[PDB]
Design an enzyme around this catalytic site. Sequence first.
Site, short mmCIF file in Angstrom:
data_model
loop_
_atom_site.label_atom_id
_atom_site.label_comp_id
_atom_site.label_asym_id
_atom_site.label_seq_id
_atom_site.Cartn_x
_atom_site.Cartn_y
_atom_site.Cartn_z
N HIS A 147 -22.39 -1.33 10.98
CA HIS A 147 -23.09 -2.77 10.31
C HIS A 147 -24.01 -2.65 11.77
CE1 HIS A 147 -23.62 -6.22 8.67
NE2 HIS A 147 -24.28 -7.09 10.08
C1 LIG Z 1 -26.69 -10.01 19.99
C2 LIG Z 1 -25.71 -9.49 19.45
C3 LIG Z 1 -25.76 -8.32 18.25
C4 LIG Z 1 -24.95 -7.48 18.15
N1 LIG Z 1 -24.90 -6.56 17.29
C5 LIG Z 1 -23.78 -5.80 16.54
C6 LIG Z 1 -25.14 -4.76 15.11
O1 LIG Z 1 -26.03 -4.80 15.57
N2 LIG Z 1 -23.58 -4.56 14.93
C7 LIG Z 1 -22.44 -4.75 14.95
O2 LIG Z 1 -21.82 -4.12 14.06
N3 LIG Z 1 -21.80 -5.81 15.32
C8 LIG Z 1 -22.87 -6.46 16.24
N4 LIG Z 1 -22.48 -7.63 17.35
C9 LIG Z 1 -21.17 -7.66 16.90
C10 LIG Z 1 -20.74 -9.06 16.11
O3 LIG Z 1 -21.65 -10.31 16.44
C11 LIG Z 1 -19.29 -9.92 16.12
O4 LIG Z 1 -18.37 -8.57 16.81
C12 LIG Z 1 -18.36 -10.00 15.26
O5 LIG Z 1 -19.14 -11.64 14.26
C13 LIG Z 1 -17.25 -11.05 15.43
O6 LIG Z 1 -16.14 -11.70 14.41
P1 LIG Z 1 -15.59 -13.06 15.06
O7 LIG Z 1 -15.03 -13.24 13.71
O8 LIG Z 1 -14.97 -12.95 16.26
O9 LIG Z 1 -16.83 -13.91 15.67
P2 LIG Z 1 -18.07 -14.07 14.68
O10 LIG Z 1 -18.12 -13.59 13.47
O11 LIG Z 1 -19.74 -14.25 15.66
O12 LIG Z 1 -17.71 -16.05 14.69
C14 LIG Z 1 -18.11 -16.75 15.31
C15 LIG Z 1 -18.45 -18.00 14.70
O13 LIG Z 1 -17.27 -19.52 15.14
C16 LIG Z 1 -17.67 -20.12 15.59
N5 LIG Z 1 -16.62 -20.94 16.24
C17 LIG Z 1 -16.71 -20.88 17.50
N6 LIG Z 1 -16.25 -21.67 18.12
C18 LIG Z 1 -15.98 -22.65 17.66
C19 LIG Z 1 -15.24 -24.05 17.52
N7 LIG Z 1 -14.32 -24.55 18.99
N8 LIG Z 1 -15.18 -24.64 16.44
C20 LIG Z 1 -15.81 -23.91 15.74
N9 LIG Z 1 -16.22 -23.37 15.30
C21 LIG Z 1 -16.55 -22.09 16.72
C22 LIG Z 1 -19.06 -20.55 15.86
O14 LIG Z 1 -20.11 -21.29 15.46
C23 LIG Z 1 -19.27 -18.64 14.95
O15 LIG Z 1 -20.48 -19.33 13.62
C24 LIG Z 1 -23.80 -8.36 17.88
C25 LIG Z 1 -23.19 -9.73 18.60
C26 LIG Z 1 -24.36 -9.66 19.27
C27 LIG Z 1 -23.68 -11.83 20.13
C1 LIG Z 2 -20.23 -6.76 3.60
C2 LIG Z 2 -21.00 -6.22 3.67
C3 LIG Z 2 -21.81 -5.77 3.71
C4 LIG Z 2 -21.06 -4.61 3.73
O1 LIG Z 2 -23.18 -5.16 3.45
C5 LIG Z 2 -24.31 -6.25 3.75
C6 LIG Z 2 -25.18 -5.29 5.40
C7 LIG Z 2 -26.22 -5.43 5.29
N1 LIG Z 2 -27.09 -4.32 6.57
N2 LIG Z 2 -25.77 -7.05 5.84
C8 LIG Z 2 -25.52 -7.16 5.48
S1 LIG Z 2 -25.93 -9.23 5.66
C9 LIG Z 2 -23.97 -9.82 6.12
C10 LIG Z 2 -23.21 -10.90 5.31
C11 LIG Z 2 -22.06 -11.27 5.91
C12 LIG Z 2 -21.33 -10.33 7.59
C13 LIG Z 2 -22.81 -9.54 8.05
CL1 LIG Z 2 -22.86 -9.92 9.88
C14 LIG Z 2 -24.27 -9.57 7.39
N3 LIG Z 2 -24.55 -6.82 4.55
#
Ligand SMILES: Cc1cc2nc3c(=O)[nH]c(=O)nc-3n(C[C@H](O)[C@H](O)[C@H](O)COP(=O)(O)OP(=O)(O)OC[C@H]3O[C@@H](n4cnc5c(N)ncnc54)[C@H](O)[C@@H]3O)c2cc1C
Ligand SMILES: CC[C@@H](C)Oc1cc(N)nc(Sc2cccc(Cl)c2)n1
Lengths: 486, 487
Positions: B460
């Site tokens: 992604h």
């Molecule tokens: C700048 C940046 C760039 C990135 N780029 C990439 C990329 O290019 N490709 C890639 O594969 N991955 C990327 N990632 C990684 C990706 O964003 C995470 O690995 C992924 O979203 C993890 O899923 P998760 O459910 O553990 O956390 P997330 O999906 O991030 O979910 C976190 C959510 O939990 C909520 N939350 C947290 N604490 C609380 C609380 N106490 N109460 C209520 N809600 C709360 C937050 O508000 C947030 O919406 C990137 C991350 C960052 C920061």
């Molecule tokens: C899981 C859906 C995925 C395969 O399709 C894509 C690709 C893309 N470049 N951006 C999106 S928008 C999006 C939707 C849910 C979570 C995240 Cl991290 C991105 N979806």
Amino acid sequence: MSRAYDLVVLGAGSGGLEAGWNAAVTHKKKVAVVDVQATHGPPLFAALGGTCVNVGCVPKKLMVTGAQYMDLIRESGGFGWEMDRESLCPNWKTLIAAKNKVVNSINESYKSMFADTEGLSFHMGFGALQDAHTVVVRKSEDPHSDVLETLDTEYILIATGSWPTRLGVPGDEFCITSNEAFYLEDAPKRMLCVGGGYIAVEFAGIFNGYKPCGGYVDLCYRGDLILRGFDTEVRKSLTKQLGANGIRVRTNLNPTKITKNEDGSNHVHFNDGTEEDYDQVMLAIGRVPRSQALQLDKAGVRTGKNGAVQVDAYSKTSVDNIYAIGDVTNRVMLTPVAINEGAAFVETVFGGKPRATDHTKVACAVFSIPPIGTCGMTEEEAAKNYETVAVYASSFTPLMHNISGSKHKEFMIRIITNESNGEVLGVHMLGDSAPEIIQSVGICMKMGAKISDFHSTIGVHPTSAEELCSMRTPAYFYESGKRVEK
Amino acid sequence: SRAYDLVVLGAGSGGLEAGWNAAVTHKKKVAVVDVQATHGPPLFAALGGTCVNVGCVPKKLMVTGAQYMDLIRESGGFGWEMDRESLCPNWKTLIAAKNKVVNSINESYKSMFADTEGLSFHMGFGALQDAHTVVVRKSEDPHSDVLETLDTEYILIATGSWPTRLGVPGDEFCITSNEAFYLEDAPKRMLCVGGGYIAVEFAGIFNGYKPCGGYVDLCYRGDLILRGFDTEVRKSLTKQLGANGIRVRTNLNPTKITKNEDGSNHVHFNDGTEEDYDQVMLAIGRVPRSQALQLDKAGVRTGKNGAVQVDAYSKTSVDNIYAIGDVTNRVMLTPVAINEGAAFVETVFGGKPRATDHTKVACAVFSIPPIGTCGMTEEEAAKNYETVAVYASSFTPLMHNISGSKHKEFMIRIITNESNGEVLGVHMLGDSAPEIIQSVGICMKMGAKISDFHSTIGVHPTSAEELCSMRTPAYFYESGKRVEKLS
Ligand SMILES: Cc1cc2nc3c(=O)[nH]c(=O)nc-3n(C[C@H](O)[C@H](O)[C@H](O)COP(=O)(O)OP(=O)(O)OC[C@H]3O[C@@H](n4cnc5c(N)ncnc54)[C@H](O)[C@@H]3O)c2cc1C
Ligand SMILES: CC[C@@H](C)Oc1cc(N)nc(Sc2cccc(Cl)c2)n1
Ligand SMILES: Cc1cc2nc3c(=O)[nH]c(=O)nc-3n(C[C@H](O)[C@H](O)[C@H](O)COP(=O)(O)OP(=O)(O)OC[C@H]3O[C@@H](n4cnc5c(N)ncnc54)[C@H](O)[C@@H]3O)c2cc1C
Ligand SMILES: CC[C@@H](C)Oc1cc(N)nc(Sc2cccc(Cl)c2)n1
Ligand SMILES: CC[C@@H](C)Oc1cc(N)nc(Sc2cccc(Cl)c2)n1
Ligand SMILES: CC[C@@H](C)Oc1cc(N)nc(Sc2cccc(Cl)c2)n1
Ligand SMILES: CC[C@@H](C)Oc1cc(N)nc(Sc2cccc(Cl)c2)n1
Ligand SMILES: CC[C@@H](C)Oc1cc(N)nc(Sc2cccc(Cl)c2)n1
Ligand SMILES: CC[C@@H](C)Oc1cc(N)nc(Sc2cccc(Cl)c2)n1
């Protein structure tokens, strides 16, 4: 049932939503999803959709695609695209604006998902464990604040993700992170990206594209070579190519003090004792798990290294009904993984048929300029782990860059095999379209494909990817962890 | 016995590969005949083959040029402000810069033959005298001065192919792929005829390099352009060429062409329309190039338009003579001809025999936007395999909300056998489709299943990550009939 909801998900994350959605739709469970806001932006940054949607993969990638136009405009002249090169500078404002719109329309897109989905319900506040089946929601981050809801449930899932690591240094307050970078008012002229993580680099790319005419960008890492955990030879060719694009990489150098100046700008004392002035300074040190106020100790869930939730292979925590995924675990901090971890959780618990996520041979990418695609073992760790290994390399400059005049842009590929069986352990690529190519590689390696399958597949001429199917005789080997020729 | 262990007729992508390998890995004495050393007219083809001089290389450069049109335009949405009044490119500085690059390969190759012992280049028209002899002549006239007379154990025919003309009054005033590359100026009013991958690639190019006020027409005798590709891909593309300003025209081929008093070309049509175009290119196709080699002198067989009659190990009618690439008319791509010519060296000179695997050859069309495809079209798949399942997915990349090119739909269509779950075909339209598909064609070389595809973890954010989300078929075919669910 004995209880109110079936599932609760702390955090509306890439992992969280996927889980919450699937449970609610494919299994019709009653599912609640807690997050701290509905639309993106400060003070909280993260919102509906997760860290990836609001302050990660989506906005980042847009800016990166913006920053590329710098090169592509410049490159075009060689193919006879003549124009006014005096107006050398972009407009950060019209980018952020255009970005916000796009990220925003996802937050809309998601609101009306919860509306349109029965079983699925969004609950805005700070999630906190009361006990093993109860989840308090509170308006303020202060744990003693007004209590907004009190959710009762069979199963709890922790998808709260992660938060930027600060460096505890005098003047830390005056720095920014990935999160703040996205809502900067103006483009920083004199920029300092600190650290050597994939964020550090991606952003150095971005700011270097959107710098005002006369600005510069410095990268700054405490270690020797940026991006540890990647193929050293890829890391070097990249460290050069950032240079070639005008990013001043700096190594064995972290700052020690920061002080705000009378004209607002930031003054930085360094590791070696240098003093310099930058408009902004970003900290891509890393990301600690975000468990620090959930009151896990109330329920009996275990923290380990900086809150990393203690979890088994099926994503189950210390408590039987409670589970945790994505970034908070600290297994692999990518989205596609968190999605899969959260999908697997739904089949395990609600779907009868159990399953755990396969963390080996996960392909991934860095959206630097130019970008990296990698899947599998680094050559260093491969030869250390497997007895006999063979390392194949190939660097070429694409035919077009003779005309575009960006002759620095070397497309590189490095396959790393086990020599005994011929199996492909790792594949490492630097160059444009490397993230697109690698995905389809990571499918081959999911099957455990061999170097015989790679070279002996027919070519797609003319591509960068066709130089995977020409890689036949190893440049060199390793014999029992020893850099060897034979 | 013989003065050369092998002669190649044609210094082709397939030819050189063979000639090189035999000379280096097996140390045989090898001669390579071609009609010139550097690219360009009158002959066009030169050292390196049709691909190097008047194909994959120059073509791709122009295509990368033509893209800048969109990418410049697209940039404004991300805040790249500039003078849009200077809307037009410079064809001259492109052709110039192209020539340089193609030329430096011809240099690169001259000094290969110099630097390689055993390898020798011989400039002229190759012609079979008999089963072991190859006459070289200066002129295309078979009766011309005789320049050399090469004697050899084995002969390989890598003479490739030549543009098919349409025998129509005014055909003389048209051009082909070959002439397109050395056009003086950019055609304002352009007519690309046909619906082959060339036809389309070039329509893309001219549409990028048209002067401000020019237009480009595509023109096909059939219904839908590019037969042999996924119909649903073919349509989304036919729309997207439209959306980029290419005026596609179907069931319409010209009947007469007449040159005008101001030089321009006037065209009478299929339906009876009359129109004026600066140039008119014929991407009808490519007939094999065997028509003057005197195969009948040696006993080698021609079939359909000179197609050399060849078995699986690339051996012809005569035992010591072989033929490869385009002249065979098996598959007219370079990577295939290369592999056919590599296999020939292991077979003959290397002891260990082998034949080229023509199934599951990935390939691409560098239209704007480009196609990557490997395997069976859904039509021919359901006709051949009893039960098939067709997976589809079209999305608009996130960036095109900002760039304002919302027409640019990235599409993927997997075609499986339903019984076993095996991936028979994969079809992609969109940017980076040629890069992605290569790595697919490796999976399909192993005969990977749709289980392997979706159940691999994602990268992604990419276009390719939407291969690993493709789970439930949009619809099926049951014994050749279009259906949702079965029995
Ligand atoms: C700048 C940046 C760039 C990135 N780029 C990439 C990329 O290019 N490709 C890639 O594969 N991955 C990327 N990632 C990684 C990706 O964003 C995470 O690995 C992924 O979203 C993890 O899923 P998760 O459910 O553990 O956390 P997330 O999906 O991030 O979910 C976190 C959510 O939990 C909520 N939350 C947290 N604490 C609380 C609380 N106490 N109460 C209520 N809600 C709360 C937050 O508000 C947030 O919406 C990137 C991350 C960052 C920061
Ligand atoms: C899981 C859906 C995925 C395969 O399709 C894509 C690709 C893309 N470049 N951006 C999106 S928008 C999006 C939707 C849910 C979570 C995240 Cl991290 C991105 N979806
Ligand atoms: C416009 C265009 C674009 C193309 N684009 C692509 C692409 O993107 N991807 C792809 O895979 N393929 C492409 N091709 C196909 C590719 O050019 C050929 O199919 C490939 O080079 C075939 O290899 P070969 O060795 O059989 O013959 P070629 O490589 O075509 O060899 C031809 C050589 O033989 C020589 N020759 C001819 N007659 C004689 C004679 N009597 N004696 C001695 N020598 C002779 C010629 O001078 C010429 O140099 C393209 C073709 C064209 C015309
Ligand atoms: C050439 C290697 C030799 C100089 O040894 C080196 C090089 C280097 N950059 N850091 C070290 S130790 C080190 C570890 C972390 C941060 C810093 Cl600044 C130094 N040793
Ligand atoms: C003890 C270091 C702690 C404060 O965190 C830091 C400090 C620093 N200068 N860079 C980073 S990022 C980083 C630096 C070197 C290698 C790796 Cl893998 C990451 N983290
Ligand atoms: C299999 C890859 C091999 C042909 O190397 C490459 C890759 C590339 N992009 N251009 C060239 S130049 C070239 C030489 C002969 C025929 C052709 Cl089609 C191209 N060679
Ligand atoms: C040029 C000879 C003529 C009789 O046949 C033509 C006409 C035309 N407009 N395009 C072509 S090429 C072509 C047309 C339809 C399907 C296919 Cl696969 C190729 N051939
Ligand atoms: C299914 C529609 C029906 C009219 O079938 C069609 C459509 C069409 N455009 N051409 C034909 S036959 C045909 C074949 C080659 C050239 C031309 Cl002009 C017509 N049949
Ligand atoms: C047929 C589904 C197809 C349109 O995919 C969809 C659906 C949807 N609601 N949003 C999107 S937006 C999007 C943006 C970047 C990458 C990807 Cl894969 C999708 N795509």
